[PDB]
Each structure stands twice: as structure tokens, then as C-alpha cells.
Amino acid sequence: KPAVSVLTMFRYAGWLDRLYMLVGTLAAIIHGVALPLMMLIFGDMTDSFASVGQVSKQSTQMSEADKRAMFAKLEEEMTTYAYYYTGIGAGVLIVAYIQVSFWCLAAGRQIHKIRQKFFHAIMNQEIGWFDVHDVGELNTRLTDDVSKINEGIGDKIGMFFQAMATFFGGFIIGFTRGWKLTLVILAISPVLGLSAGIWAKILSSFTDKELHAYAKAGAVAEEVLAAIRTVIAFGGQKKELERYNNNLEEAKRLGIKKAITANISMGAAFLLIYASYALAFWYGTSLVISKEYSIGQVLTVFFSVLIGAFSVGQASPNIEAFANARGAAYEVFKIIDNKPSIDSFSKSGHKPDNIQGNLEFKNIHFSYPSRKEVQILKGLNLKVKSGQTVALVGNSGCGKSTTVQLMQRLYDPLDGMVSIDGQDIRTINVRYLREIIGVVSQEPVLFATTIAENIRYGREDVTMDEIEKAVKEANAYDFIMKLPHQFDTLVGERGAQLSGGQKQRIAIARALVRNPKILLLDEATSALDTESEAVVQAALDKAREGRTTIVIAHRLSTVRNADVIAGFDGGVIVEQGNHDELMREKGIYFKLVMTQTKEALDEDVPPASFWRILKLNSTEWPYFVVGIFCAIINGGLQPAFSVIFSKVVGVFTNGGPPETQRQNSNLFSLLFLILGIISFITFFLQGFTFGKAGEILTKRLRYMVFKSMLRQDVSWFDDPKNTTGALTTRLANDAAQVKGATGSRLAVIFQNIANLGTGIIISLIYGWQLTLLLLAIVPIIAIAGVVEMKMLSGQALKDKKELEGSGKIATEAIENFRTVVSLTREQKFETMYAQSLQIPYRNAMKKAHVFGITFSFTQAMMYFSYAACFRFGAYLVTQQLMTFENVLLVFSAIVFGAMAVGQVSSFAPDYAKATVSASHIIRIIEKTPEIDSYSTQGLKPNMLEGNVQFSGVVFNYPTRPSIPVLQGLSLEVKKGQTLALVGSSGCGKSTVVQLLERFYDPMAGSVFLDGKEIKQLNVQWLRAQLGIVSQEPILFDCSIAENIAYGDNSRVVSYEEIVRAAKEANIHQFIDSLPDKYNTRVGDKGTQLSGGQKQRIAIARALVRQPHILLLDEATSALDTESEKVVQEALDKAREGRTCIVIAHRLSTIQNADLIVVIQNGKVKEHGTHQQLLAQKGIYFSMVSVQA
């Protein structure tokens, strides 16, 4: 992975920028040392209570002379301590403000330039650059990578500096107050980073093992959901359910172990930090007995070294964000500092005013930059006189278009020169070059705006009258005036779709506005019907007036009209001259003449569900039984600690017997270790409980989901919100993430309720008033913690919603770069881009200020809490209310309690995302379709007859109930005879074939098979005797023998039936010939096949089950040569003795069909055989007339 030098990355920072960064970082440093200072002050605080405990403990000394020496002393010490706390806090709000504010600011300002210059630099690039580069990733790079470099030069490094400042402040204060203790603790430190470092590698080892573990089931998951039509139709729902399931009990059972080891990681972390607590206090408390360190000093250094330690662990992502922001900056600055071969932005060439317009190509050798290996033009020589029109032909290769492309100087030739008049095309400014060159491409392209605006894109300073005139010159004025909004009518991608001819004509006009003296037509008439081609070419021929035109037309119809016809054999020009010369020479021209004669949309919709999801995992009670208890234990562990820490520092603050100072000390210290041991037990138990549950719950769930997915209707798979990829992603992720809302959430809620719940009881008994204070301040701070992330993500989505404006402009500009580069107008699109960006950047100031005041409001009172609680508590202890140790207990219990609930909240997966990934699962499972392929009811007669009779049957698609497809059309087919369907297009050419296979239910009316109604029959058994052949036959990546046997399921097909079905599908020839027999895989994983053979296999598939009803729906549309012969030849020998229905557009193999039904609109208007309908001279006469 690549990365920029740190110095290079801030290149677009200026005066004010460096200023902001420096001021900010400076405030970040001092914000950093605020916490260690806080620690020291805390030590100095506890030292003071330690003095008043011991004297009033032992016996009785002076009753009236204690209130003066103890009570009066402490208040005098706390009135100043308060000033310290509060002082530091008040400073902290300011300096934190400066930090986030300035860093966010300077970052934003930089980024604004960065994105702009990235865009301009993308525009600057020639097309040769867009050949070698994917435009999709480039356009997303302008949004993703720039937003990615925004993060890493902003708040993140501010916090990095705060963090390193806390590291240095903490270790400095550490060693200053305490030489030894800090070295003890720092001695303990390398055993936690060595522990966190091996356990991350362990969890991450299984994480990527899982990705390619489930991807075996995901394969057959997308394989099924893609070919789902061919699945339900061959009823392989059972087999595919099984097949999918066999790859589940191998890839989540792999996950079980990983869940366990990650749980043991957590356990070991806890055991280790608790070991650290134990050892540190065992040292320090025995150290305060020898009267070396004070009790408060031990606290000071333990806490400042500890805080200084976790500083690193909360600097890690802040420095990581800086790192990969450099790696993203690489790609962007590469383009910005890249100057192309064709610029194409500034003028350095000439701008002839003659301007003549004589073309010349001398010895042109050229090859595309994507594939230098293959040479395109070899010694290309071609002159074009003024006003003369030259057509390019020969059907050689790309070369044709290449010349056109070379003419507007998209690329440059490898050898040889392209000269307009006396000067080379390279000696003239490129902007002015494409201003004097107009172009019409094979595919028209209109930008999303008004027609007027699309026209402006050819020339900016054009009056409305010039516009109208230009439109008229394009024979386009007519249909534009017929539009509802005239010249303000929307076009392009979204809104108001226009035909290809009109769309092309507007482009013709656009080009015409430029008034070029040279005109290039690359397959202008191509890809158009014969009725619009006339009008379009009418505009073109009038556009060729006064202009030097070179035209390439696949249709040589409009070619003869040219002055000079130039043929292409290979890379060289061979035959050149007038039409008659090339006809007489019988060249290549003569040859050709004779031969041609959704992500948000998903999660928005579902309502529900509050805790019903737990019913899903309820299949295993034991695991949850152990689980919940284990969490109550690990949850009571935390309040325990706060008590035990308060008894450690209590035995030296509340005085008493010195001989018992040790006995207590080592007891509590050792006790901490015990509290760690048990802590390692819970987490080893939890991952064996919830861990397996949530994983079992995963497997089973997926199974259920997949099953239900096969139950569904065909209408559901027509739903624009349910795609093979979206479905398989619903199966892959949401199905696994469901475990978040079950066990994990019980763990969380129980650990939290155990912690803050019991801790609040204890802090309530050890203090009435102070507890009331903390259960008041703490929630208020917690509320601020929510709003902090509310106003953070809140104006994070609002900022992207105003940024989509820029996104659209850039997108439209990039996706059609190859088009805009021809109309120049690159700088215009840049201008649009900046104009779009001027609104979010004006909101960067307010943004930075907001993040400032928010971060500062949350962070300020994080010190004012200590300020309040320790002042009120001192107020307690000094008076008759007791004591201080209890004050410290209430504080630690409630505060680290509330902190612990936060960390427990951060451990488990996101409950919101879990629930919304759960509701899709539960809805998908409990989903009952109309047509149930799983039902075991049904007639199942012995009657092998098989008469299809549609009566009435009015049907319209549920996906889009607009313009009903079937309007109650009726027909009937008896046994052996073959129906045929004739109409303008599909619907209901295919709709019938679908309704007989019962993919949909017609609104009113009924279709009968034999004497019985379809709806009365068994659903599955109905398709058991119906073979189906679609336009594009799909096979399964399993094997050939299975593909063939896939036709008749629930039965042992074996060698015999497969060879029998192979031999009449005539495919048996292709089988032995190609190594090897029946074991070969189709397709794209094994050997590739042509459509013909694959469809032959497909027929052989629909032939195994011995169907009494064939359904042929536009069988082969892409099959040519003598391949379509053997296909229908194999079709004809299996058609006899079978009820068949054929839909084709061929109309050549329908003359031999038994019944021919001409369906139009929503009914049947013609009926009978071929010659009968033909002699009827209706619409069948007019449709079979286009066969010449």
C-alpha cells in the first residue's frame, strides 16, 4: 500500500492554515496534560483526609481542639483544591475548543482546494488517460478518497497531540511525584501490549478465514437466486435447500471457536489489568507503611502512569487515520501534479482566421494506448479538399473511427502527421481546434437539464434566437414545440425520455451552434430505425453545407452520396475515388455492397420489532440460562472493585492500628487478584454460552430464510427491491448479525443492570446526600454523551446531503468525459462544480465552531464533576457526616460504574443495526406466498391427456399494474397439436407460458388443464409435467449429468435415463467427442460453451421428465449459422405426441404449427392456421409481409 510523505500532504495549507494548525496543536498539548495534573491534585487531596482520620480514630485526644485542627484545616485546603479543579476545567473547555475548532477548520479549508484541483486535474487529462483508467472508481474516488483525506488532517491529529501530551504529562508527573512506583508500573506495561498484540492477530486470523468460509455457501446462494426462474420451474427447491445447507455446518462451526478465543482474549485482558491493580497496590500500600510514599502519592503516580498508558491506546486510531489519509492522498495528488501531453487547457498554439478547412493525413501510423501490441493504422494517407465530403468504408476494424478520433486530436499518432492546411494540427491551440471541429457520435448524449441548456453546452454566449435558428437547422424545431414546456423541457438521464432520433437531432443542433468549419460523423444514422434515419440524415445533409465533412456509415445507403469514397483494407488505404470507380474496380467496397444487398430503501420500510427477535434464539435455553447468570456475575464484578479499591486507600485515610495496615493491605491487594481470576472465568463462560447460541442461531436462521426464499412467488422476485445480490447479501450479513439482538443484548443489559444496579445500592448505603448528587450529575453527563454523538452524526449526514449536488455534477461530467472533451467545456463543468461546492464550504466554519462548542461542553464538566462531588463530599466528611472513604466509594462506584456500562455498550454489536437486520430476517421467514410450492395437497390424476384451455383470464403484473398485459384473452390446445403465438412483442407472449407454469394468478377468469382448474391441482405436480425452455438457458456449475437429471427430481435418474434423453436431444454426439464424458462442468468454471450446445443440454433437461407439455418461449434468438438447424431438428422429434406451445419472431417455423394465434392489445383478434390467416389479409398479412 502506497503513501505520501507527511510534508507533501499539507501542501495546500497557507498562512492562516499553518496558523490554525499550530494554535490548535498548542492547545491540544495543554489539554493533554490536564488529566495528569488532575491526578496529582487528587493525590494531594487524599493526603489531606489521611491526616484527619488517624487522630480521631485511636482513643480520644482533644474534643474541642480537633474541629480547629482537622475540620477547619480541611475546609481551608478544599477551598483551594476546588479552585484548582475548577480552574483546570475552565481552562480545558477553552483549549479543547481551540483544538477541535482550529484543526477541523484548517483541514476543511485545505480539503476545499484539494477536491477542486483533483476535479480540474481529472478534466485536464487527455482521453488516453481515460482509456487506461476505470471511470467508475475515479468518480467514487473524488467522493471517497477526498473525504478520506479530510479525515486524518482534521480533529484526528489534534486528538493525537492531546494523547501524546497526556502520555508525556502522565509519565513526567509520574516520575516527578514518584520515582519507584512509576518504574514498577511501567515495568508491568510491556506485558499488556504483548498480550493485546497476540490476541488481535488471533481474532483477525479467523475473521478473514470466515470470509472465504461462508463464500462456499454464498456461491450456491447466488447460483440459485440468479437461476431461480429455472429452479422453481424444475422444482429443485428441495435439492437446492439441501445443497445450500451442506455448506453451513462447516463455516459457522468455524466461527464458534473464533467467538470463544475472542472471549478469552477479553478475559485475559481483564485478568491482566486486575493483576496490575493487585501488584501495584501490593507494592504501594506496603510502601506507605514504611512511610516513604504518602497514600496520595501512590494514587497520584499509579493514576497518572495508567492514564498516560491508555493514552497510547486512544492515540492508535488517531494516528491510523493520519496514515491511510496519506495513502489516499497519493492517488489524488498524482493526478493534480500530472500534466498531460495534450493541454488543452491553455493556448500555446495558433488560431488561424482563414480558416480554409483542408484535411490531410501523411504516413499515419498509430496504435491505441491500451494495447500497444496491436498496430491499427499502417501508413495511412488521405487528403480531404474544402467543402468535400469523404466517406470511410471497408469494414477493416477500429481504424475508421480512429481517423475521426485522430482528427479532433484525441490521441496523437505514433509516426506521421495530421495536417490541416499548411500547419500541423499540433501547431494550433487545442481548444480552438475543437471549436472549429464539430462531431456527431454513434450514440447521442444529452445532459440532464433543459434543451436550451444542452444547446448552451455547445456555445455559452448564444441568444435565444440563435438557439431557435440552430434547432430549425436540425429539423428538430417541430417536436420541441410539441413538448409541454418547450425549450425548458427536461432531458438527459432522469425525466422525459426521448427517442434516439430526436435525442441525436438535439445534438446535431448543439454542434451546429458552434459553427465549425469541419464536421465529423461517426455512425450518425447507425442504431436507428428507418423512419427517423430519414429525418436525421436530412438534417445532416443540410449540415454538410459549407463544411468539410468526413462520414462513416455502416449503412452504405447514405455513403454513395459522398464526393470521395475511401476504402480500408488492414491499416492502409487501398481503393480511393468516386462511387463508380470503386464499383468498377470490384474492390472491397464492391464486396460490402454485394454482401449487404437501494441500501436505505431496504431498512426504511420495516416496522418492528421490540424483543420478539429473542424468540428466534429461544431454541437453546441452557446456553442463555448459563449466559445471563454469568453476565450478572461479571456485572457484579465491577461494583466489587470500587469497594475494594476504596478499602485499600481507605485503610490509610481512615488511620487506625499500624500493625493492621499491612494485614489489610496485602489482603485487599491479593483480593484484587482474586477479582481478576473470577473475571477470567465469566468471559470464558460467556463465549461458551452466548457465543455458541448466537452462532447456532445464525446457521439455523440462514437455513430458514433460504427455505422461505424458495417458497416465495415469482412476483416477489420481480420486486425491484429483491435482487440476487441484495438477497444473497440479506442472507450473508443480516442473518448473522441477528445474534446481536439476542444473547449479546441479554449479556449487555444484565451486566449493566448488575453494575450500576448493585453499585447504586452500595453507594446509597455509604452516602445519602452525595449519592443523590451523583445519581443526578452522572445521568446529565450521560445525556450529553448521547447528544455528542447525535449532533456529530446528525450534521454528518446533512453535510453529505448538500454534497450530492456536487456529486451529480462531477458524475455527469466524468461518465461522459469523452463527450464533453469534444465540446471543450471542461472548465465550464469545473465552474459548475465549484459553484456546487461553495455552499458546503461556507458551512465549514459553522461546522468547526459547532464541533468545538459540543466537544468543549461534554469535556468541560467532566472536570466540574470532580469539582462538585469532592467539594460536597469534603463538606460531608469535615462535619459530623461520615466519612471520606465512603465519599470515595460512592464516587468510584457510581462513576466507574457508569463508565463500565459505557464500555460494555461499546463491546457488543450495534443493537440498532442488529434489530433492523433482524426484522428483514423475521419478515422473510414468516412470509406466506400465494403459490406455495411446498404444499402437499393437489389432485394428481392418472389422466395423461393434457388439454390446455385458457378461458377469460385477465392478468396484469403486480410489480407494475399499469397497462394490463392480458385483457381476458382465451384459447385452447388439445393433445399432440402445437400452439403458436404471434404478436408485435412480448406480454403476453411470455405471460401465457408463465401462467401455465403458474407463476402468477390472473385477477379474474380461469385457465384449465384437462377437465380440472389449475388452482385445484397440486402446484408442484403441475410443473412436474411441464417442460420449459427460455430464451437464455442457464445451467448449474455442478456437472452435466446433474444438469440433465435436474429435470426430474425426487427420483434416481441414473446412467440409463440420462443417455436416453441425451440421444433424442441429439447432444450425445458432442458428449463423447469432448474429454471427458458427463463429468465436465458448465459453465465459466469448466469449459466455455456456445449458446447452441448449452440450449441443447437445456432441452435434454426438459426432456428427461417425459413432459406431456412443452413450453417453447422465443427458444433461440441469438443462434445463427447451421447451429439453429440441429437445434430445432432435435426439437421436432420430441414435439410429436406432446402438447407444445411455440413463441417465435421467426414466423418461418410457424407455418407448420397446428394452431396460430394472433394476439394483440390484450386479446385475440385472429385465429386459425397459416394460409387461412394469410388469406384473411388482416394484421397477420401485414406482419408476415416483412419476411422479404
Ligand SMILES: CC(C)[C@@H]1NC(=O)c2c[se]c(n2)[C@H](C(C)C)NC(=O)c2c[se]c(n2)[C@H](C(C)C)NC(=O)c2c[se]c1n2
Ligand atoms: C483508568 C483505567 C483504570 C480505566 N478503567 C476503568 O474505569 C475500569 C476499572 Se475495572 C473496569 N474498568 C472493568 C472491569 C469489570 C474489568 N472493565 C471494563 O469496563 C472494560 C470492558 Se472492555 C475494557 N474495559 C477495555 C479493554 C479490556 C479492551 N479497557 C477500557 O475500557 C479502559 C481503558 Se483506560 C480504563 N478502562
